[PDB]
Structure 1
Amino acid sequence: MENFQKVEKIGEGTYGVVYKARNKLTGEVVALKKIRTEGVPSTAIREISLLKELNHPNIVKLLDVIHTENKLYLVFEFLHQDLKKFMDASALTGIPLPLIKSYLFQLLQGLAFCHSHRVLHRDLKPQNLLINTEGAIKLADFGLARAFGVPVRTYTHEVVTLWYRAPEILLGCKYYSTAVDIWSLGCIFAEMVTRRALFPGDSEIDQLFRIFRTLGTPDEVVWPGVTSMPDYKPSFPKWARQDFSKVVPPLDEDGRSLLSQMLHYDPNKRISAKAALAHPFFQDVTKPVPHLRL
């Protein structure tokens, strides 16, 4: 736009493109997300405009929403790096546990806030978590919900990452609960610790079976109602559960205990963000500053 002197492209989310841009008059640097559509509906702005009144230190601030010309531009405060890039940069040495703990704690604070205000993220992944030089981490790109996963991709031809998707979604549940966000965050937590994605599936069934191979194929005992799920098949292979000592070494018992509660199959048994903040794992939490190379 003529209002922004687009600096550079910084991403390709799942609904459009994200640019780093400067407000020619204010001189502010922001992240400008363009969204794709027979004139772009208006039943979205209502829930979008809501996200705008959702301010928390661990949530990327949505500054402006502009529909004009039937295109929809989202203007967010700009952060210099995402967690995916930081994880990659920290691959050889690993993110120090104290920083891993700080980030997890802040993200749970952010989710606790969203959830208490009936807002679900729905698509948490490293690329959607932003960090700054001050040690903060913030939730971004709330998948804007749109329709709980609809359409399905950006707008042209991109391969959506399934690695952080909760089992109930993969089994066809039509109504997501706040529990889906805790699952994704648990997966991210594991990844920061081991430096390898926990469940790197390449298709919906491979994603589901990677989960089953590690946590055991769910049954009515651990997940009441699972065999009645839309996409559940009695023909699913029956895998035995593995121990967390083997899944996220060398994370300590407090860490493993918290992770196990974030990864419970039954959405109803999965720990809430609020309850997770009280877990003994955070007894000694602090706020370290990351070594950010910008």
Structure 2
Amino acid sequence: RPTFYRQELNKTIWEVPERYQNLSPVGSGAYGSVCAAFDTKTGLRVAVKKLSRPFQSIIHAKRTYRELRLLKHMKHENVIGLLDVFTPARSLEEFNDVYLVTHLMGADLNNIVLTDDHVQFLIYQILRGLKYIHSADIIHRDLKPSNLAVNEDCELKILDFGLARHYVATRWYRAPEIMLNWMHYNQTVDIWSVGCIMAELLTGRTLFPGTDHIDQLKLILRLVGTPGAELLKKISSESARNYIQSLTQMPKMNFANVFIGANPLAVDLLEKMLVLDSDKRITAAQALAHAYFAQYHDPDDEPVADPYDQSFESRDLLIDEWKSLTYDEVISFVPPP
């Protein structure tokens, strides 16, 4: 039973425990908003995410539940972890609000903008966290520089703000198979994104700054070329395949000529990540074993996730039921050691 306080920031009432103080707005979108706070029970600086009308729809109530489940599951140095989760409501019937708390880590990756050595370490930690996440049958799906928390010492956490924002456009970092619904995507959609980030850290430019999905694809195929017969027949979507079949043929660009003056090991890795056929794209675990990361690679300290129960994903429930599952998850939360 902590003593909560009401307070209003920017738009909305935040009712949170007394321990958290000096809430400062950092982010708002359709799905919620984040503040920095000080936590007086630890002395450390936190992010406090308040979801907005968590249970306003089915899709929202499940999204809410999902986030709570994911964040509770994540126990990795290179991925966001849950310090606290709370609600004012002292009953399920009262429960309308969910606040998530985490260890604030400072800038994100585009604000933190870099030696080639920095690039290795950062891209190494991305892949390290990604190997973990992928090990739980989780696809991040929105991996861009704003969803990477980096501190003073270039230590990195993967997160997802997931606020619905309106600027780092998620399409800039999206693999074309998930962007244009070519086919049944896999986890390597995240590898593509890491490729774009890596590129960007090295050149300072966004790799593919497309203005929409059509421009996006244009820009992509300029570099990687248009798909051949082989990949074309993997685009199981006919409308998507017909569109591709109609584009002007583009040759793959030799990346050594594109990423001029880059560690040739970084170029080679790029080539392996920025593969259009996700059947051929390097994976997280494999990429960690690349020579680009020799200074960091340690197969003995590149850990995998405990088993993540996503049976719920196959459920069609009512708002009230998603809301009760969420509630259960809040009460069963036990903090960090």
Answer yes or no: same fold by TM over 0.5.
yes
Q: What letter matches 1:23 in structure 2?
A: D
What is residue 217 of structure 2 aligned with on the other side? 208
How many equivalent residue pairs?
269
What is residue 127 of structure 1 aligned with on the other side? 146
What is residue 147 of structure 1 aligned with on the other side? none
What is residue 150 of structure 1 aligned with on the other side? none
Q: What letter matches 1:84 in structure 2?
A: N
State how 1:49-64 maps to structure 2 within 5 Å: 49-51=68-70, 52-64=72-84
Whether the aligned pair in 1 keeps the contact of 2:146 and 2:168 (CA below 8 Å) is no
Runs (4 or more) in structure 1 with deviation over 6 Å come to none
Q: 1:229 to 1:247 in 2, by over 3 A?
A: farther
Q: What letter matches 1:65 in structure 2?
A: V
Tell me the percent identity. Answer: 38
Q: What letter matches 1:203 in structure 2?
A: D
How many Å apart are 1:60 and its aligned residue?
1.6
How many Å apart are 1:159 and its aligned residue?
8.3
Is 1:34 paired with 2:34? Answer: no
What is residue 154 of structure 1 aligned with on the other side? 164
Question: Which deviations, in whole Å up to 9, do the C-alpha atoms of 1:71-119 show, x marking residues without a partner?
Answer: 43221211011111012xxxxxxx1011110111111110001101112
How many Å apart are 1:158 and its aligned residue?
8.6
Q: More displaced, 8-17 or 212-221?
A: 8-17
Question: Which deviations, in whole Å up to 9, do the C-alpha atoms of 1:214-237 show, x marking residues without a partner?
Answer: 111123235541374553313222
Task: State the distance in 2 between where 1:133 and 1:159 align.
Answer: 22
State how 1:1-294 maps to structure 2 within 5 Å: 1-3=15-17, 4-12=20-28, 15-23=31-39, 27-36=43-52, 39=56, 41-51=60-70, 52-66=72-86, 68=89, 69-87=95-113, 95-141=114-160, 143=162, 154=164, 157=166, 160-173=169-182, 175-222=184-231, 224-226=233-235, 228=237, 230-232=239-241, 233=243, 234-285=245-296
Task: State the distance in 1 between where 2:257 and 2:22 align.
Answer: 47
How many Å apart are 1:162 and its aligned residue?
1.4
| RMSD of equivalent CA atoms | 2.6
How many Å apart are 1:131 and its aligned residue?
1.1
Task: State the distance in 2 between where 1:223 and 1:66 align.
Answer: 49
Q: What is the TM-score with the length of structure 1 in the denominator? A: 0.82
**Partner secondary structure for residue 20 of structure 1:** strand
Task: State the distance in 1 between where 2:43 and 2:277 align.
Answer: 49
Q: What letter matches 1:163 in structure 2?
A: W
Q: What is the TM-score with the length of structure 2 in the denominator? A: 0.72
Q: What letter matches 2:164 in structure 1?
A: T
Larger radius of gyration: 2
Task: State the distance in 2 between where 1:124 and 1:220 align.
Answer: 29
Q: More displaced, 185-194 or 222-231?
A: 222-231
Q: What letter matches 1:244 in structure 2?
A: F
Task: State the distance in 1 between where 2:200 and 2:169 align.
Answer: 18
Q: 1:279 to 1:159 in 2, by over 3 A?
A: closer
Structure with the higher helix share, 1 or 2:
2
Whether the aligned pair in 2 keeps the contact of 1:224 and 1:266 (CA below 8 Å) is no
Q: More displaced, 16-25 or 206-215?
A: 16-25
Whether the aligned pair in 2 keeps the contact of 1:220 and 1:226 (CA below 8 Å) is no
Task: State the distance in 1 between where 2:140 and 2:146 align.
Answer: 13
Task: State the distance in 2 between where 1:254 and 1:222 align.
Answer: 26
Whether the aligned pair in 1 keeps the contact of 2:183 and 2:235 (CA below 8 Å) is no
Task: State the distance in 1 between where 2:274 and 2:69 align.
Answer: 29
Whether the aligned pair in 2 keeps the contact of 1:219 and 1:227 (CA below 8 Å) is no
Task: State the distance in 1 between where 2:128 and 2:277 align.
Answer: 22
- Unaligned runs of 5+ residues in structure 2 are 1-14, 90-94, 298-337
